[PDB]
C-alpha cells in the first residue's frame, strides 16, 4: 500500500554475512547546515536544522527551521520526504537540542531556550527553560493554532535533578503519553557512585575513579549528565506538566544524545557512546518508567574518537569524545539492526551503511568516497508495500557542510 511503521510481519530479509554489494543506496535530498534532527513515524516525518554563516563551529546562525511533512512513494517505488509545514523562530540563536515525537495529527518538538549558548557548555549559567512547538502534518488554512502552536513549559518535575533538557533526535508515544530523550544535570557533589563498579579489570592505565570522573564534560565539571526521558501526558489537560525519568545505571555512561523508538511492537533505545564505552549502546527497553535498557553486547560497531577514547576502546578513561551514529532494529528474533557508522578510528569520516547483528556485520556499503568527513547520523526504518526501507540523514562535508538524506532498501536475498 503506502508507507507505514515497521510493524507486523515484514517481507523477509537476508540474514547471512555477504560481502557482495547488495545494498543499493538512493540519494533523495539534492554557508553551513548543522544540528540536524530527523524522525519518521506513520508515513510522516519531522526534520530540523540550523543554518549558520561561515563556520560550523563558530559563526552566527542565520536561520533555525523545524518542519514536518509526508513520506511517500516518489514515483519509482522509492520513498522520499515532502515538506508540508515549516516553522522558524525569530532568534535562531535561542533554540537548542530539539527533539520530535509524533502523536496522531501533530509532531510535538521539545526544545531548550537559551541566551548563553549551548547549555551543555554553559551548564551553570543556563536557566532551565523549555518549549514545545506543535506542527500539524496535514495543515489547513485559517485554522488558528492548528498548523503551528508554541507553548512555554512552566511545570517541570526533575526529581533530584537541578536542570533537565531534551537530548536526542526523537521519542515515542505510549497511548496519549509522549516520552522525549532527555538529560538531567546533577551536582557532582550529590552524585552517588561506587568506584568498585568501574570495570577496570584488565586495563593497565585505568583507575577506578575514571568512571565517576567521566560522568561530566570534564573531571572537574560542576555537573554530571545522566540520560533519561521527559514524559508529557496529553490526557492531563491543564497546562503542560513535564516529568523526568532517570535511566538505570547498568552500563551507565555520560548523559548523551539518545533516541527511543518503536519497532515490531516494542520500544528500543539507543544512546550515543561519548566517554570510554566506545562500543555501541542500544537495546530493547525492559521498562519505560523507570527507564531500563537491556543493552546488546555488540562487539562489531563502535564510533570514532580522539587520543584517549578512540574507536573500539573498552577501558575506562577520563574523556568526553564521540559522535551520534544511531541504528534501528529491523528484526527482533535475530536482533538485526540498520545504521550508519563512521569507518575510522580517530577522525570523523567514511560513512558506511551497515546491517548487523551483535557479533557480525551481515552486509554494508559506503555512502561516499573515502576521506569525506562526516558527523551525526540518524537512521529510521519503516515499511513500503511491506518492504523494509530505511532513510538515513548523514552530516557531510563536500563544497558545503550539510545533511544528505539516503533511502536504502534492505534486500530479501543475498544473491548479488
Amino acid at each position, epitope marked *: 500500500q503506502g508507507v507505514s511503521d515497521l510493524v507486523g510481519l515484514p517481507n523477509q530479509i537476508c540474514l547471512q554475512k555477504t560481502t557482495s554489494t547488495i545494498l543499493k543506496p538512493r540519494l533523495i535530498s539534492y554557508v553551513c547546515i548543522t544540528d540536524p534532527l530527523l524522525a519518521v513515524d506513520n508515513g510522516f516525518f519531522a526534520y530540523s536544522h540550523l543554518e549558520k554563516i561561515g563556520s560550523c563551529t563558530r559563526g552566527i546562525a542565520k536561520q533555525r527551521i523545524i518542519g514536518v511533512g509526508e513520506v511517500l512513494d516518489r514515483g519509482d517505488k522509492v520513498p522520499s520526504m515532502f515538506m508540508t509545514n515549516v516553522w522558524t523562530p525569530p532568534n535562531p540563536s535561542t533554540i537548542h537540542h530539539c527533539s520530535s515525537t509524533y502523536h496522531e495529527d501533530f509532531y510535538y518538538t521539545l526544545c531548550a531556550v537559551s541566551h548563553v549558548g549551548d547549555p551543555i557548555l554553559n551548564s551553570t549559567s543556563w536557566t532551565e527553560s523549555l518549549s514545545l512547538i506543535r506542527l500539524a502534518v496535514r495543515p489547513k488554512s485559517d485554522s488558528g493554532d492548528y498548523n503551528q502552536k508554541y507553548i512555554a513549559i512552566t511545570k517541570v518535575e526533575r526529581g533530584k535533578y537541578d536542570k533537565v533538557m531534551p537530548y536526542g533526535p526523537s521519542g515515542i508515544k505510549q497511548g496519549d503519553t509522549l516520552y522525549f530523550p532527555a538529560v538531567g544535570f546533577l551536582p557532582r557533589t550529590e552524585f552517588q557512585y561506587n568506584d568498585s563498579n568501574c570495570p577496570i*579489570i*584488565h*586495563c593497565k592505565y585505568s583507575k577506578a575513579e575514571n568512571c565517576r570522573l567521566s560522568m561530566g564534560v570534564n573531571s572537574k565539571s560542576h555537573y554530571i549528565l545522566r540520560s533519561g526521558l521527559l514524559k508529557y501526558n496529553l490526557s492531563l489537560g491543564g497546562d503542560i506538566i513535564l516529568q523526568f525519568i532517570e535511566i538505570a545505571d547498568n552500563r551507565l555512561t555520560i548523559g548523551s544524545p539518545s533516541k527511543i523508538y518503536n519497532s515490531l511492537g516494542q520500544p528500543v533505545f539507543y544512546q550515543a557512546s561519548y566517554s570510554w564505552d566506545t562500543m555501541i549502546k542500544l537495546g530493547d527497553v525492559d521498562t519505560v518508567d523507570p527507564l531500563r535498557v537491556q543493552w546488546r*553486547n*555488540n562487539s562489531v560497531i563502535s564510533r570514532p574518537g580522539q587520543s584517549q577514547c578512540p574507536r573500539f576502546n*573498552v577501558c575506562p578513561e577520563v574523556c568526553w569524545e564521540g559522535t551520534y551514529n544511531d541504528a534501528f532494529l529491523i528484526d527482533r528474533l535475530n536482533w538485526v539492526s540498520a545504521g550508519v557508522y563512521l569507518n575510522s578510528n580517530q577522525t570523523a569520516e567514511n560513512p558506511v551503511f551497515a546491517v548487523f547483528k551483535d*557479533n557480525e556485520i551481515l552486509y554494508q556499503v559506503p555512502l561516499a568516497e573515502d576521506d569525506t568527513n562526516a558527523q551525526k547520523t540518524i537512521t529510521d526504518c519503516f515499511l513500503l508495500e511491506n518492504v523494509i526501507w530505511c532513510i538515513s540523514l548523514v552530516e557531510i562535508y563536500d563544497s558545503v557542510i550539510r545533511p544528505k538524506l539516503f533511502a536504502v532498501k534492505i534486500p530479501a536475498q543475498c544473491s548479488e
Partner: antibody, heavy 121, light 113 residues
Framework: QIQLVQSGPELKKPGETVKISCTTSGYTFTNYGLNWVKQAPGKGFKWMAWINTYTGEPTYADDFKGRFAFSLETSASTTYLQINNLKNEDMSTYFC??????????????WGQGTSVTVSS | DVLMIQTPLSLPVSLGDQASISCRSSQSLIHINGNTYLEWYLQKPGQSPKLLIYKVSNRFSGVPDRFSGSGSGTDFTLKISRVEAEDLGVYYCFQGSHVPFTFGAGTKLELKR
C-alpha cells in the same frame, strides 16, 4: 626462568589472620597483573581477585570482600593476599598466577606452587 | 555469575583412544571487544594447574598438537586426539569474559579397565 614463588604452608587458629606472599621473577613485574585462586580440598577452583601491577588496584569478586585484602609491594616485585578473621571455611590451597592485560595475554600461563592454609585450634 | 557446565565429570579412556570434554556456558562469552576468553587448564595431583588452551582454540607454548579446542558462543569442546599416560589428570574450563570469573566442576581423565 619466569617463576612465581609463594610463602610456605600455614597453620592458624580460627579468628587469626594470615598473609600469603607470592613473589615473581624472570620478567618485568608491571607488564602483567596477577590472579589469586582458591582450591578447596578435593574440590574445584574459584577465582578471587585480579590485581593490576601498574596501578596496584585489585578487582575482586563479591564473595571475597571485606576480610580479604589483595595488595602488592612493587619494590619486592611481590603480591600479598591477607585474610583477617579466619574461619574453617577458609582452609584451602591458594595459588597466584600470572595474567596479562588486554595488551597481551590475559590467560594464566605461569602459576605459583600453591600455599596451604590449615585452620585448627 | 556465569555457570560453567563441564560434562562429563569422569572420562574413562583406554591409552591411545580419543577423548572430548564439553564445556557449556550460562551466558554468552563473546566480550564486547570481540574476543571469547574461554581457556582450558590441566591439573595433575600435587602440581600446579597448567595452561593448555586460550581464546577457545589457541594452544599455549609447549602443548602437544593432540589437544585442540573448538566452539563458539556458549558451547565449547576440548579434544584429545590420542590419550597418553601424561595426559591423565583433571581438566578445567574457565571463562574470563564476565566478572566474577568462573571455572567448571572439572573432568577427571582416568584410565579404563
Amino acid at each position: 626462568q619466569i617463576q612465581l614463588v609463594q610463602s610456605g604452608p600455614e597453620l592458624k587458629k580460627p579468628g587469626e589472620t594470615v598473609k600469603i606472599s607470592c613473589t615473581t621473577s624472570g620478567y618485568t613485574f608491571t607488564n602483567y597483573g596477577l590472579n589469586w585462586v582458591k582450591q578447596a580440598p578435593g574440590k574445584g577452583f574459584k577465582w578471587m581477585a585480579w590485581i593490576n601491577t601498574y596501578t596496584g588496584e585489585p578487582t575482586y569478586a563479591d564473595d571475597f570482600k571485606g576480610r580479604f585484602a589483595f595488595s602488592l609491594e612493587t619494590s619486592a616485585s611481590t603480591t600479598y593476599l591477607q585474610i583477617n578473621n579466619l574461619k574453617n571455611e577458609d582452609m584451602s590451597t591458594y595459588f597466584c598466577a600470572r595474567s596479562g592485560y588486554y595488551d597481551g595475554l590475559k590467560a594464566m600461563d605461569y602459576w605459583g606452587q600453591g600455599t596451604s592454609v590449615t585452620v585448627s585450634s | 555469575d556465569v555457570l560453567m557446565i563441564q560434562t562429563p565429570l569422569s572420562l574413562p579412556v583406554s591409552l591411545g583412544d580419543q577423548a572430548s570434554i564439553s564445556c557449556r556456558s550460562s551466558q554468552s562469552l563473546i566480550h564486547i571487544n570481540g574476543n571469547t576468553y574461554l581457556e582450558w587448564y590441566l591439573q595433575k595431583p600435587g602440581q600446579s594447574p597448567k595452561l593448555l588452551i586460550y581464546k577457545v582454540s589457541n594452544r599455549f607454548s609447549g602443548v602437544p598438537d593432540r589437544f585442540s579446542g573448538s566452539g563458539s558462543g556458549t558451547d565449547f569442546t576440548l579434544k584429545i586426539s590420542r590419550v597418553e599416560a601424561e595426559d591423565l589428570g583433571v581438566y578445567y574450563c574457565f571463562q574470563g569474559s564476565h566478572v566474577p570469573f568462573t571455572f567448571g566442576a572439572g573432568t577427571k581423565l582416568e584410565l579404563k579397565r
